[PDB]
Design brief:
monomer; mainly beta; Jelly Rolls; seven-stranded antiparallel beta sheet; ligase; B30.2; E3 ubiquitin ligase; PRY/spry
């Protein structure tokens, strides 16, 4: 329910990321940029949020994914830690799919869950704050990939992480 028009929040972006000027695309750069030290900025983890956070309702958006390893995306609670090295786990307030070692995974803790979904090109993220779910679909055939069940009780932001050079995420279109 309700396609949303998202832009990456440049006050959150870790200084090693390269954002697109239209605030849709993100990759990892070779060096930290000299960005201003905003309190909301991830100073260590390779993360950026969208500027829009959701308190209720059902929302969906699409993410164009690179073929090469080194990305994760989904949603984060607003209280996700910004300063210091924070584990990438549901307990630390991130719910995401990742591509690592040529395999797709739901980032569950304490063990990640391997998916057998085959090659991904674009992924729909559906957030339902009434039901308490974030779900991922392959856009081709809208095949269900994975749903995290969470009793979300703070604002939820779209989350992107790129931890290797040579891959990318882009909010589509």
């Amino acid at each position: 329910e309700e396609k949303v028009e998202l832009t990456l929040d440049p006050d959150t972006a870790n200084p090693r990321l390269i954002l697109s000027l239209d605030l849709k695309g993100v990759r990892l750069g070779e060096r930290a940029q000299d960005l201003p030290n905003h309190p909301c900025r991830f100073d260590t983890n390779t993360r950026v949020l969208a500027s829009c956070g959701f308190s209720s309702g059902r929302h969906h958006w699409e993410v164009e994914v690179g073929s090469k390893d080194g990305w994760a995306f989904g949603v984060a609670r607003e209280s996700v830690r910004r300063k210091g090295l924070t584990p990438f786990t549901p307990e630390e307030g991130v719910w995401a799919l990742q591509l690592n070692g040529g395999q797709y995974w739901a980032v569950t803790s304490p063990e990640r869950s391997p998916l057998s979904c085959g090659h991904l090109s674009r992924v729909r993220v559906a957030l339902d704050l009434e039901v308490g779910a974030v779900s991922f679909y392959a856009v081709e055939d809208m095949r269900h990939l994975y749903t995290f069940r969470v009793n979300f009780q703070e604002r939820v932001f779209p989350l992107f992480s790129v931890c290797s050079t040579g891959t990318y995420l882009r909010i589509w279109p």
